[PDB]
From a paper:
Proprotein convertases (PCs), including furin and PC1/3 among nine mammalian homologues, mediate the maturation of numerous secreted substrates by proteolytic cleavage. The zymogens of the furin-like PCs share a multidomain architecture comprising an N-terminal pro-domain, a subtilisin-like catalytic domain, and a P-domain (also called HomoB-domain). Activation of furin is triggered by two sequential autocatalytic cleavages and subsequent release of the prodomain. In this work, we investigate the structural and functional basis of PC-activation to engineer prodomain-based PC-inhibitors.
We created the mutant (77)R-K-S-A-R (M5) that combined these features, carrying positive charges only at positions 77,78, and 81, as well as eliminating all possible multi-basic cleavage motives (Lysine is not recognized by furin at the P4 position). In excellent agreement with the findings above, M5 (Ki = 0.042 ± 0.002 nM) was ~8-fold more potent than M2 and ~36-fold more potent than M3 as well as resistant to auto-activation. Indeed, we could obtain crystals of M5:furin and M2:furin at pH 5.9 and pH 7.0, respectively. The structures of M2:furin and M5:furin were refined to 2.0 Å and 2.4 Å resolution, respectively. Four and three copies of the PC1/3-prodomain:furin complexes were observed in the asymmetric unit for M2:furin and M5:furin, respectively. The main difference between M2:furin and M5:furin is found for the secondary cleavage site loop between Lys73 and Ala83. This region was well structured in M2:furin at pH 7.0, but no electron density was observed in M5:furin at pH 5.9. We also applied crystalline material of the M5:furin complex on a gel, showing that the prodomain was intact. Thus, protonation of His72 at pH 6.0 will change a productive interaction to an unfavored contact, probably destabilizing the conformation of the secondary cleavage site loop. Consistent with this observation, the last amino acid with visible electron density at the N-terminal end of the secondary cleavage site loop in M5:furin was His72. The structural data suggest a specific destabilization of the secondary cleavage site loop at acidic pH.
Residue numbers in the entry:
A (entry chain A): 110 to 125, 130 to 574
B (entry chain D): 30 to 72, 83 to 110
């Protein structure tokens, strides 16, 4: 196998301490036949490293209500982001221009939807564009990473997510690849971001070249895996296509990780086009590598898998992803077991611990023995939300941090049926005692009440 | 913050959403993405309420701009 000859390919250190993408290329997997769409601020479809792979069938301009998603050109190049993410996925190879994409033979599209008023309807139009032509949607955007916002998809966007995974791709389910967030400097927790917290989205985090947690990284239990991205000034960054037919070597942040993940999934879908949206998540859990990723919270869960709140299950391994996909057996239909835990409201005060032994819908059609996502839907009041830290312990003993202290969150609105999600008990037996922990991390006299705690289990039998 | 767009859930189908637009005085912009029975209207809690109270509309809401960060 002859590797890319593109001029900036040697600078794509993260391709071939890397994501093991060359190994998938040598197996014959470069993304041919897979369609990926970038939901962002537009895509320079005439870019010399994108035009050859551009697909108008995966593109639309929601902001200006027209098929052409061309970015709006300004002095500051404000609308360069979508083009940078598209080059990470499907930049053309062996044409002497800039570098290559992870899936350099895939068709790439873009939905221009951030350069304008982003409403619930605008998001739903983009998430549901041509769902039987687009296989993978890559989105890095979400609520403000100020460390004090609790926001997620509204009704239309939420429905569009469900419609995608239920009926998209001929029923196999649209793949939504999402970036966990850039609120590290504000001590943000990406479980307060309903887009990455969703079970319908494949949440991806960032690691620096030296294998450390970047300054912008957000820790939460909803993240699934990690790909490389920017770090400090001694560490290299992501090399991709830039606006005005230029090349860039300084693509940063968690927005540079999600498209890399979408490209690896595009390679995986070529190795097995029958994979469901849940199948793809199972593959990521099983093949992701924690090795050489530095984190102080690596913990082994009930099935013996290393898991971190900064990294999820570890680095994406494209070679291992495509290898396991070829002979992967489609998982059984998803089951959803809803268990109401609280019989009465509980006073939080300084510390609250809720223990409940559950049968996981035993004797019912939603009986679960192999867990996938687990949810704790909490409705609580508190006088300073940022002081709360919430943990959820599975019967197997796996400690999931649902919410970490957010020092900038001075809100008194608490949480209203907010679905904190965790991926750390994947493949565990949900039967047994579940423990919820809510404690005040500050020395101040804080007060509040937990009024509803619904434990929502997903998985198979 | 708020825009002049209303989303309504109409189980009757596009024919029902078309009659709804004419009777109440709205502009049917069409189906929202892939949501078969969710439509967007152009013409304000009173405007929203008028849409919701119709027995053909199961859910209605006025659209409003939200802060969305690129990462
Ligand atoms: Ca190239
Ligand atoms: Ca965030
Ligand atoms: Na997610």
């Amino acid at each position: 196998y002859q590797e890319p000859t593109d001029p900036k390919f040697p600078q794509q250190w993260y391709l071939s301490r890397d994501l093991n993408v060359k190994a998938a290329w040598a197996q014959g997997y470069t993304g041919h036949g897979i369609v990926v769409s970038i939901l962002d601020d537009g895509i320079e479809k005439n870019h010399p490293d994108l035009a050859g792979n551009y697909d108008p069938g995966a593109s639309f301009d929601v902001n200006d209500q027209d098929p052409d998603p061309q970015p709006r050109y300004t002095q500051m190049n404000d609308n360069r982001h979508g083009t940078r993410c598209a080059g990470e996925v499907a930049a053309v190879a062996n044409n002497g221009v800039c570098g290559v994409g992870v899936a350099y033979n895939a068709r790439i599209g873009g939905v221009r939807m951030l350069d304008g008023e982003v409403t619930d309807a605008v998001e739903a139009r983009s998430l549901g564009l041509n769902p039987n032509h687009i296989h993978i949607y890559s989105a890095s955007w979400g609520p403000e990473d100020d460390g004090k916002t609790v926001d997620g998809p509204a009704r239309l966007a939420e429905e569009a997510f469900f419609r995608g995974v239920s009926q998209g791709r001929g029923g196999l389910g649209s793949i939504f690849v999402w970036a966990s967030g850039n609120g590290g400097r504000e001590h943000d927790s990406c479980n307060c971001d309903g887009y990455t917290n969703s079970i319908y989205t494949l949440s991806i985090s960032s690691a620096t070249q030296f294998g450390n947690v970047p300054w912008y990284s957000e820790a939460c239990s909803s993240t699934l895996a990690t790909t490389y991205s920017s770090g400090n000034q001694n560490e290299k960054q992501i090399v991709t296509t830039d606006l005005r037919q230029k090349c860039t070597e300084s693509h940063t942040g968690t927005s540079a990780s999600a498209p890399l993940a979408a490209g690896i999934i595009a390679l995986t879908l070529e190795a097995n086009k029958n994979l469901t949206w849940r199948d793809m998540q199972h593959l990521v859990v099983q093949t992701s590598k924690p090795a050489h990723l530095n984190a102080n919270d690596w913990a082994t869960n009930g099935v013996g898998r290393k898991v971190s709140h900064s990294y999820g299950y570890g680095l994406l391994d494209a070679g291992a992803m495509v290898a396991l996909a070829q002979n992967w057996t489609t998982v059984a239909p998803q089951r959803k077991c809803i268990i109401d835990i609280l019989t009465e409201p509980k006073d939080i005060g300084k510390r609250l611990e809720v223990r409940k032994t559950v049968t996981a819908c035993l004797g019912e059609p939603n009986h679960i023995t192999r867990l996938e996502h687990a949810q704790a839907r909490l409705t609580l009041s508190y006088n300073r939300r940022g002081d709360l830290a919430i943990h959820l312990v599975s019967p197997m003993g796996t400690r999931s941090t649902l919410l970490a202290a957010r020092p900038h969150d001075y809100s008194a609105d608490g949480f209203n049926d907010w679905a904190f999600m965790t991926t750390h008990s994947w493949d565990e037996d949900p039967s047994g005692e579940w423990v919820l922990e809510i404690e005040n991390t500050s020395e101040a006299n804080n007060y509040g009440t937990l009024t509803k705690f619904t434990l929502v289990l997903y998985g198979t039998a | 913050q708020f825009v002049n767009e209303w989303a309504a859930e109409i189980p009757g189908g596009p024919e029902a959403a078309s009659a709804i637009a004419e009777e109440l005085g709205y502009d049917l912009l069409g189906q929202i993405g892939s949501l078969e029975n969710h439509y967007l209207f152009k013409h304000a809690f009173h405007i929203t309420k008028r849409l919701s109270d119709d027995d053909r509309v199961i859910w209605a809401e006025q659209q409003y701009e939200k802060e969305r960060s690129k990462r």
